[PDB]
Amino acid sequence: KRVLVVDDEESITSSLSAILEEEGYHPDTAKTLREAEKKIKELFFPVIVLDVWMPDGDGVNFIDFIKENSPDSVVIVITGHGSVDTAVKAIKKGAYEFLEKPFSVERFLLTIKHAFEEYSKKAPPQEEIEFVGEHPKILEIKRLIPKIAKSKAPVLITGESGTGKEIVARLIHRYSGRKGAFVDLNCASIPQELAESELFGHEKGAFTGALTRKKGKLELADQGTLFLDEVGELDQRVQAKLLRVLETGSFTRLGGNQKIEVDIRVISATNKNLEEEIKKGNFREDLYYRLSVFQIYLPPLRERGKDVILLAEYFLKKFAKEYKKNCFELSEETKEYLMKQEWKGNVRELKNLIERAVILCEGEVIKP
């Protein structure tokens, strides 16, 4: 845990060093902007404590030096008493925090603590999302996604099982720009009535003897995107509750009375024709129109021309690489065979079929 202290006065560099060292941190000090630049380029300090004023340059602007040669460093500026216009200046330049002289040991240490947890708090979801397909129907969806995404209106994705409905949903979230999490709830894979609990969470023992609070998916999706997989499988009790949430923008946990406001973009998916389910009285009509302000239809795999080959090659590579196998080409015979299949399980079926092929691999894959 390193901390670089940049300041003109010993009262700062010494005191702070005595304090930091006393608290488990390993301090270093620079007495000039020159000496500082040296140490920054030489070694990485998670946290840098910088005086707004320095002899050999503008302490504020020096933040740019740090921004340039140590982008991960979290900066705390020290500013003279009363002069906190400089402080804002620094903050807008990208400093994380500032301390006004004079300040106590306690105030210093607390700010340092937060500087380190700011350093320790980075998001790594750099993940790219693979959405393979060149059929005109798929290219049309790919062009539509970015147009739909920057809205907050809900999206209903219709398609057979295993057609990539979740991929499209993540893409939409990605493009929407929303900073919150992508929370997916499977409304079928979950027990009939555990659903209402997954969504709303519980607090104080909602289920038989718990007394331990748990956050619902609604809440976990705050400022993000909630993906409801097979929304058609929701109890008509849950449907009603979910509706009231869409309408009020708040809810309560199971067992609690505390009002909770959420901000979610709702994406739903179904392999049913929900307009037909409404007629059969198996799905609320008002909820349907709420959830389907925008719609996207994903065609079955067998309607996608030669995407079946594209996908096969994509899976064959991904698995052969990952299971250290030496089978990287599909035989022409194999390609013909794939094109003759119905794929009732669609991409999910294809993927599993190719993964199987690789698990039992040889030099090149042919088609039993």
Add this chain to the structure above:
Amino acid sequence: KRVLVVDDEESITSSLSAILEEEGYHPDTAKTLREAEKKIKELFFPVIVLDVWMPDGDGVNFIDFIKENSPDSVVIVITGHGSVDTAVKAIKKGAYEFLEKPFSVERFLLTIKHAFEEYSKKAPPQEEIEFVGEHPKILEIKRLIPKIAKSKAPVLITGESGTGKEIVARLIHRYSGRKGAFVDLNCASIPQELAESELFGHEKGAFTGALTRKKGKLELADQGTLFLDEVGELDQRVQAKLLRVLETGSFTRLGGNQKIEVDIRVISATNKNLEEEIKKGNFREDLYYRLSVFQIYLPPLRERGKDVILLAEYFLKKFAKEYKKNCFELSEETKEYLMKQEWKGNVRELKNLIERAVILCEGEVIKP
């Protein structure tokens, strides 16, 4: 986004409300602890500003109330000038920050910004890792894991492909309590070239045109765990560079001279016998000794008795529920046939085979 300002003074609650309102927040105020109690049990406030002194009770204690009735609320306490003593008490009771009157509007808004950052910075509490097995060899590994975990010494996990090495590694990370990321590096999937690049990172135009900075996995695993899948597939150059990092505890990126320090717990996995690779001169003794302070041997599926059935029933139940199917039972004949396979692909092979069965699933029983 709601903020509750609990303060005895009218000028305070009015001013701060107006500032919050102007900045986009949704302020609410309470002039007494009684009034604050009412609003808190009824509304969730992501952030609560509380004066250490209140007429009708001790403000610092009121933190416990909040901590009990609104656990996820982040609290900023206001303190009189000099009476920072009392702020320390509040921070110790769980307050997140404190503001010493008098304070500027920027200081206030900067602290509020940070308090919402704190509110929004959360890890996905949901997290279950399934390690299915009741064979005495697997039960022993399960007892070992929690003990091995708490240490920082590296763990080497040996076993055939598909035996659950990555699973055990996450369990160890989990039980270890480390706060950083679990960082997976597949030493095989990656081309011999990207080897050094994935681990260490780079910055400016090292190889063809890479003027864009990239963080190594070493860096990304900071305070967390680095899983080296197939550690034996690392060339002798990297082996040495990696060895150097375990010795010193620091590194530089490629095309970089800045010394960066890491705190990582290393877990490595192999399907070879590295003691033999050393005799073959394929792997360094010294690195091996550093990586093998703790060892775990995962037995092939075929050496696990009836776990093959336990696993087959676990996957069947998982996939049938997930793919909306109703094949939930293994026939006695299926169980017999499973018991007679070699499972060269081990659990990976089994899992895929059962998913296959469920994807093509017809009735409620699987037989072939």
